[PDB]
PDB file of C-alpha atoms and ligand atoms in Angstrom:
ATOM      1  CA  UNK A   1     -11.185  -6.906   8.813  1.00 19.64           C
ATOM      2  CA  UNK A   2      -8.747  -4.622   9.408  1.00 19.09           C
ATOM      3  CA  UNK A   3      -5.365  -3.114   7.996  1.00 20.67           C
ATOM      4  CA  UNK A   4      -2.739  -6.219   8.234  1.00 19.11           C
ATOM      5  CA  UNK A   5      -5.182  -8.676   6.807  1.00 21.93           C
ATOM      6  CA  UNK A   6      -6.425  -6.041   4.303  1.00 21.46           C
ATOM      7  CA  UNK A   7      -3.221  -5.844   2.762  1.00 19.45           C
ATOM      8  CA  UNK A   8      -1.995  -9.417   3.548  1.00 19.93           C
ATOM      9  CA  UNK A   9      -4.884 -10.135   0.218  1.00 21.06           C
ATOM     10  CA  UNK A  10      -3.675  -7.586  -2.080  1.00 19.11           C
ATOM     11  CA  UNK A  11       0.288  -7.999  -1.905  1.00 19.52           C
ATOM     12  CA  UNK A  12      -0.034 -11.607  -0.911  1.00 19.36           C
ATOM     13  CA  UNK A  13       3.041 -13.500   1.207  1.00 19.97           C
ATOM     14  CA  UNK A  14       6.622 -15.165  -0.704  1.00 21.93           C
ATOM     15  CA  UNK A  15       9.291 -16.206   1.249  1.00 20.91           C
ATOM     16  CA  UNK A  16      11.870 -15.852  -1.696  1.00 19.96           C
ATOM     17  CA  UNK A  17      13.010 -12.491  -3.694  1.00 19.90           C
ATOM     18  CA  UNK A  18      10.343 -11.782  -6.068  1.00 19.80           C
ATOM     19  CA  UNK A  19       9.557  -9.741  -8.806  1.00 21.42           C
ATOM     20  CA  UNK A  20       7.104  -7.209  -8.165  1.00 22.20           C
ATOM     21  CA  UNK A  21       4.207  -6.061 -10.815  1.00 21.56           C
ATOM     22  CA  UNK A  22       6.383  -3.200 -12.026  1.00 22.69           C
ATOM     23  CA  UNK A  23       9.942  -5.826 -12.085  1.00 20.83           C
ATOM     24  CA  UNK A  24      11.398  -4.905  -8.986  1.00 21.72           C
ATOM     25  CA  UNK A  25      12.625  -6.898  -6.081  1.00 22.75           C
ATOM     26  CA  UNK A  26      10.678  -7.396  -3.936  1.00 21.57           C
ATOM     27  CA  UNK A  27       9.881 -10.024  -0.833  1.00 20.71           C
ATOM     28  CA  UNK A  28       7.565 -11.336   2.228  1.00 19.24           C
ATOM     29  CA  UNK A  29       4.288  -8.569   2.079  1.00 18.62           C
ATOM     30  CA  UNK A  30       5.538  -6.780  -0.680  1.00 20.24           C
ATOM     31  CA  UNK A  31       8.424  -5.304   1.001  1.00 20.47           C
ATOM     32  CA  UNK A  32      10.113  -3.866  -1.400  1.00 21.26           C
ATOM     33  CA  UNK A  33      13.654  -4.296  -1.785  1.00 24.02           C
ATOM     34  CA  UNK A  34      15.158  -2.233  -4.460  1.00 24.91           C
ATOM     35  CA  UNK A  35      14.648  -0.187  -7.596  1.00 16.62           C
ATOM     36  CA  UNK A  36      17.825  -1.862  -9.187  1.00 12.98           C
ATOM     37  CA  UNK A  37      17.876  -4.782 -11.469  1.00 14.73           C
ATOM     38  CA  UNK A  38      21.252  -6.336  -9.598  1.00 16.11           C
ATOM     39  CA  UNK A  39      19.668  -9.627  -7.627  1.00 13.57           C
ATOM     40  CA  UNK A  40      22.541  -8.794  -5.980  1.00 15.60           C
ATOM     41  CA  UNK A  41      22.006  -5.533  -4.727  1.00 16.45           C
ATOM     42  CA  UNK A  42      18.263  -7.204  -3.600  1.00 19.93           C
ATOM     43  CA  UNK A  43      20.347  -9.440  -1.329  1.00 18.65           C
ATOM     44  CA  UNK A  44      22.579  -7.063   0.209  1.00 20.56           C
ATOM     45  CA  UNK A  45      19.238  -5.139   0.800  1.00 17.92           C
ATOM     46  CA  UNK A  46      17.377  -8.337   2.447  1.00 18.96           C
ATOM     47  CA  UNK A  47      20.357  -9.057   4.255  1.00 21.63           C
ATOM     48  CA  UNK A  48      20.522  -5.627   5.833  1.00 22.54           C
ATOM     49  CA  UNK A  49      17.141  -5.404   6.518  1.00 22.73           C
ATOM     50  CA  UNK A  50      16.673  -8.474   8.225  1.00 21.40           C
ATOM     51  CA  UNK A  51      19.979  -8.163   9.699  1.00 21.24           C
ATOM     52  CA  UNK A  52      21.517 -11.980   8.574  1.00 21.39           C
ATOM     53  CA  UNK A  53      22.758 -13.629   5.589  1.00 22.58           C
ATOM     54  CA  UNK A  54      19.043 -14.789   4.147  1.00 20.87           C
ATOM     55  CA  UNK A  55      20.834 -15.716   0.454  1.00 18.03           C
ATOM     56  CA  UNK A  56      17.234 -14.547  -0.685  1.00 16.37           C
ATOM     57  CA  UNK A  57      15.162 -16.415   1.875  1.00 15.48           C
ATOM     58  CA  UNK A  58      13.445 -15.530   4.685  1.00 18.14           C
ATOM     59  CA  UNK A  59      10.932 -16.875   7.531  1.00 22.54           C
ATOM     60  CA  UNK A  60       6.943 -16.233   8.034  1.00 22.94           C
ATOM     61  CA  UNK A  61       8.323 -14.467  11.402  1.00 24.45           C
ATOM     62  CA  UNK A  62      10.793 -12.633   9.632  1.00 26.25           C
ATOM     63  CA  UNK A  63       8.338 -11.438   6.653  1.00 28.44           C
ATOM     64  CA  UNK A  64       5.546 -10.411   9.202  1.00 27.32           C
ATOM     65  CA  UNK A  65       7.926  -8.463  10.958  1.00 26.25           C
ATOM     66  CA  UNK A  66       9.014  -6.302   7.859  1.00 27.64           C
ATOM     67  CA  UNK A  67       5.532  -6.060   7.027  1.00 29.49           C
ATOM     68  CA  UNK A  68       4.825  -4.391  10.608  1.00 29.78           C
ATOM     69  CA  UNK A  69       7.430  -2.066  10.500  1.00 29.86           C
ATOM     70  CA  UNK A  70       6.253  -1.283   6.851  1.00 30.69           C
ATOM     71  CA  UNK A  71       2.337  -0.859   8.153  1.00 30.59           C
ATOM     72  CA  UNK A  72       3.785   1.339  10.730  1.00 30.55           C
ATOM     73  CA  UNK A  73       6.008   3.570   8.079  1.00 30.19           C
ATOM     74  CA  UNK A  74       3.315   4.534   6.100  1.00 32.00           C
ATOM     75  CA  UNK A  75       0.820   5.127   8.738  1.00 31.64           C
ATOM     76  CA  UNK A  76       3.864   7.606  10.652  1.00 31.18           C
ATOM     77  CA  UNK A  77       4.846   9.179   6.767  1.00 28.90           C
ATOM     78  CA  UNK A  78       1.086   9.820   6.434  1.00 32.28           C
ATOM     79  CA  UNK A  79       0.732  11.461   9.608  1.00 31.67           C
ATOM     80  CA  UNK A  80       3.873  13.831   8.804  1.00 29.86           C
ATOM     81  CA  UNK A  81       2.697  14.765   5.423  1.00 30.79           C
ATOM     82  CA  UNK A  82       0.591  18.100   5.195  1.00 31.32           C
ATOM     83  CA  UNK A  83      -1.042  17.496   2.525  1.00 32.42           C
ATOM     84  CA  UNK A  84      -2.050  13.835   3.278  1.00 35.18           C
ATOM     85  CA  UNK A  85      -2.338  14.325   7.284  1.00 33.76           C
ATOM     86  CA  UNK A  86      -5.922  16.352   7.144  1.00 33.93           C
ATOM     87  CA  UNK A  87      -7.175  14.374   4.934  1.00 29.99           C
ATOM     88  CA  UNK A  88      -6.577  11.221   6.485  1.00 30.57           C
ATOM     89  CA  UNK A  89      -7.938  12.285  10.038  1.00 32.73           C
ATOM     90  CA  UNK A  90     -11.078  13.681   8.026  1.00 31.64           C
ATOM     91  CA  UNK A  91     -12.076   9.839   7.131  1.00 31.69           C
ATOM     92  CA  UNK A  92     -13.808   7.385   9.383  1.00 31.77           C
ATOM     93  CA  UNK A  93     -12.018   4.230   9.875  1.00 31.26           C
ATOM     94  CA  UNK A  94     -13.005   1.725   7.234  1.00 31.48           C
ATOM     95  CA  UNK A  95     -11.613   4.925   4.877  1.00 31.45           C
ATOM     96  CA  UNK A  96      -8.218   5.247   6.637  1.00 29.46           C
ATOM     97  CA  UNK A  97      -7.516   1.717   5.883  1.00 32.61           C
ATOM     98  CA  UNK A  98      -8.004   2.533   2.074  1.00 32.52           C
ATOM     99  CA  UNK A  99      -5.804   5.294   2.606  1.00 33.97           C
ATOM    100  CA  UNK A 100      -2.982   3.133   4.548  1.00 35.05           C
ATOM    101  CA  UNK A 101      -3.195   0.789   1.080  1.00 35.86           C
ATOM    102  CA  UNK A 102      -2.570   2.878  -1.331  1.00 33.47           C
ATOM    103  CA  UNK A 103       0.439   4.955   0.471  1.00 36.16           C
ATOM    104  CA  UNK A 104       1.749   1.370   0.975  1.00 36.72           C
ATOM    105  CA  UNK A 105       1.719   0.418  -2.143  1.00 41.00           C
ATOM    106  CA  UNK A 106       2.708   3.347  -3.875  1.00 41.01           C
ATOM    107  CA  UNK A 107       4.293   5.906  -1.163  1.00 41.29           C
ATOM    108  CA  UNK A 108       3.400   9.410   0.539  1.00 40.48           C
ATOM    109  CA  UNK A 109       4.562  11.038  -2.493  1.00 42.13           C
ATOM    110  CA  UNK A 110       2.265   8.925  -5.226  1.00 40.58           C
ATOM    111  CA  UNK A 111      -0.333  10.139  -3.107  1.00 41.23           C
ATOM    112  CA  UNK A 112       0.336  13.512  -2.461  1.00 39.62           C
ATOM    113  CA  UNK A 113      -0.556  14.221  -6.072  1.00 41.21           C
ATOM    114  CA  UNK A 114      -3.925  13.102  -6.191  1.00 38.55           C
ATOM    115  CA  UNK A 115      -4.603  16.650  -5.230  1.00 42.84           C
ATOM    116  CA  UNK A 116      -8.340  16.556  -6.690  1.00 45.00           C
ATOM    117  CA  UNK A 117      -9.235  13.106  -5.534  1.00 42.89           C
ATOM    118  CA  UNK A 118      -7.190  14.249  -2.074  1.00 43.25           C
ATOM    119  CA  UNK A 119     -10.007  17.069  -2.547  1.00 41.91           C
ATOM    120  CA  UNK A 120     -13.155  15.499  -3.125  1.00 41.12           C
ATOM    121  CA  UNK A 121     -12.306  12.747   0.163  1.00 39.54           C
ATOM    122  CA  UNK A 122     -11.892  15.482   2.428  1.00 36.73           C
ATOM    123  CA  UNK A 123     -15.193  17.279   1.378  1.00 36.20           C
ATOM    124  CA  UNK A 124     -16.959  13.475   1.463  1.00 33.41           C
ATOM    125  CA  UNK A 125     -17.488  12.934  -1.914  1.00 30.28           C
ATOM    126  CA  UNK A 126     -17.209   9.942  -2.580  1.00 29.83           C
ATOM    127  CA  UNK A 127     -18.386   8.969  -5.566  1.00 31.22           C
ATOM    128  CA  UNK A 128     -16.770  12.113  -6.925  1.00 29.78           C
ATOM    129  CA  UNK A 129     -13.336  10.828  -6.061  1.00 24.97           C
ATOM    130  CA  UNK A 130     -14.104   7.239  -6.620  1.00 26.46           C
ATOM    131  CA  UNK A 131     -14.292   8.279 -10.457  1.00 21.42           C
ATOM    132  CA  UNK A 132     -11.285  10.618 -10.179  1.00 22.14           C
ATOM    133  CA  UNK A 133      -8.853   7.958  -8.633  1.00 24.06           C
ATOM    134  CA  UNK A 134      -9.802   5.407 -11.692  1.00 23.70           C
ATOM    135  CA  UNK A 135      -8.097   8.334 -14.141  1.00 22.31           C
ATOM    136  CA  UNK A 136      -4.865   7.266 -12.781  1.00 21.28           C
ATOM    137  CA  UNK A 137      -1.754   5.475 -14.596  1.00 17.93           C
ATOM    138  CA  UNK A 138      -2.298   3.243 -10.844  1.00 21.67           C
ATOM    139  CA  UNK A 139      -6.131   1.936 -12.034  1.00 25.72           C
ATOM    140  CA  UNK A 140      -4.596   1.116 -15.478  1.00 25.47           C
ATOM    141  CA  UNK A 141      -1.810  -0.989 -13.966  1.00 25.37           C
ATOM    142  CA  UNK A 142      -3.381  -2.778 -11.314  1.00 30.45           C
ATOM    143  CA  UNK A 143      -6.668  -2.494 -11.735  1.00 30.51           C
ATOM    144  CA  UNK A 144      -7.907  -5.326  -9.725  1.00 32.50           C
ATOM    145  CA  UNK A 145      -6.448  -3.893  -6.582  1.00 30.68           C
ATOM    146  CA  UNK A 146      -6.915  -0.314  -7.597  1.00 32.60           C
ATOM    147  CA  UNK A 147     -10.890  -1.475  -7.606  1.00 33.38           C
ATOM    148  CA  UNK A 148     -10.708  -2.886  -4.509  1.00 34.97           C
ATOM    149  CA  UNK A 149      -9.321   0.327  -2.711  1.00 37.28           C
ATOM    150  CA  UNK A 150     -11.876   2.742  -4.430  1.00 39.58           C
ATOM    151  CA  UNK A 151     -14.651   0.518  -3.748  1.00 40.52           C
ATOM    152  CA  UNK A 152     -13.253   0.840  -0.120  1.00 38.88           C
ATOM    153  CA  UNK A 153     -13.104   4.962  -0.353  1.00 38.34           C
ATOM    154  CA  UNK A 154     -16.458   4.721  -2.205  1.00 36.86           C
ATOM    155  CA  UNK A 155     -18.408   2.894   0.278  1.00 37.86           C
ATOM    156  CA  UNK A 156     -16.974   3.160   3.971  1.00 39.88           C
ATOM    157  CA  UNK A 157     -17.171  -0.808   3.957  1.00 38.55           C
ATOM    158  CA  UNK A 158     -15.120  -4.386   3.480  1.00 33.92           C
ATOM    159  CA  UNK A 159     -17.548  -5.662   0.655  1.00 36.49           C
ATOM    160  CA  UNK A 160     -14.858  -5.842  -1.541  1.00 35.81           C
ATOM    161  CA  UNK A 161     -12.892  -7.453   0.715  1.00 35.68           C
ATOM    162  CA  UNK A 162     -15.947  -9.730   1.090  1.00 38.79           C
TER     163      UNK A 162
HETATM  164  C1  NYL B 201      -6.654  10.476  -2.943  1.00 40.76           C
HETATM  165  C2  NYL B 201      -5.909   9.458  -2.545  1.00 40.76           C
HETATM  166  C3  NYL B 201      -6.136   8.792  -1.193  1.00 40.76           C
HETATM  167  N1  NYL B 201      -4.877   8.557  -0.481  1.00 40.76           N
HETATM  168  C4  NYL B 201      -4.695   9.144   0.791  1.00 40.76           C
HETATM  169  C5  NYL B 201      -3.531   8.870   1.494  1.00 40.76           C
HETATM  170  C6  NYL B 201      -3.326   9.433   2.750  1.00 40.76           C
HETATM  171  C7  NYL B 201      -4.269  10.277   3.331  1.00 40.76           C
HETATM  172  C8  NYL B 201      -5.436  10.556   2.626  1.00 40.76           C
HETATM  173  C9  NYL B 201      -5.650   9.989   1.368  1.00 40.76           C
HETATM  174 CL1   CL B 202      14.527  -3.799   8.636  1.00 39.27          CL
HETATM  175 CL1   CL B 203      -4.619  -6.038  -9.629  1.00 38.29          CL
END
């Protein structure tokens, strides 16, 4: 197991716009597209980003390649971020790929105000900050994934991932 197949199970793989869990369009490994409801403004975006006239489709190739660039994004905006950065090179590496999840799904910011949970990782506590990241608006909305994460902080290992 590792990152890329981690997250190809929780965001899944459509090769047409799509609506994500919170309405917004979104395409190939939950790339998002854009905050606005204008399908339109989602195809300009696609378009743009994949650098042709998709009309809201795109290929396997052309999804997996947003979805690297995206991996690597996260990874880089983790890395910058001084509040996320020590934590993240505190964590062995089962851990980090929790980490890379949830900043991918939700961004650096999201994440940078889990200041207590952010905490309790760093000082290896993890059931501690297993229970703190459930108190979260994220748990409530997706809590099938959200378990699946915290498992992963909790335990250091791909069970849930079977
Ligand atoms: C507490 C939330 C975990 N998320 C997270 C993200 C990046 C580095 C370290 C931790
Ligand atoms: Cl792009
Ligand atoms: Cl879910």
């Amino acid at each position: 197991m590792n990152i890329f197949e981690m997250l190809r199970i929780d965001e899944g793989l459509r090769l047409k716009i799509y609506k994500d869990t919170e309405g917004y369009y979104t395409i190939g490994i939950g790339h998002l597209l854009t905050k606005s409801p204008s399908l339109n403004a989602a195809k300009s975006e696609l378009d743009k980003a994949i650098g042709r006239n998709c009309n809201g489709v795109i290929t396997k190739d052309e999804a997996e390649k947003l979805f690297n660039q995206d991996v690597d994004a996260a990874v880089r905006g983790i890395l910058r971020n001084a509040k996320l950065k020590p934590v993240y090179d505190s964590l062995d590496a089962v851990r980090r790929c929790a980490a890379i999840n949830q900043v991918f799904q939700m961004g650096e910011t999201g994440v940078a105000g889990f200041t207590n949970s952010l905490r309790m990782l760093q000082q290896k506590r993890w059931d501690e900050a297993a229970v703190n990241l459930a108190k979260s608006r994220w748990y409530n909305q997706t809590p099938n994934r959200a378990k699946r994460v915290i498992t992963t902080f909790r335990t250091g290992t791909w069970d849930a991932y079977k």
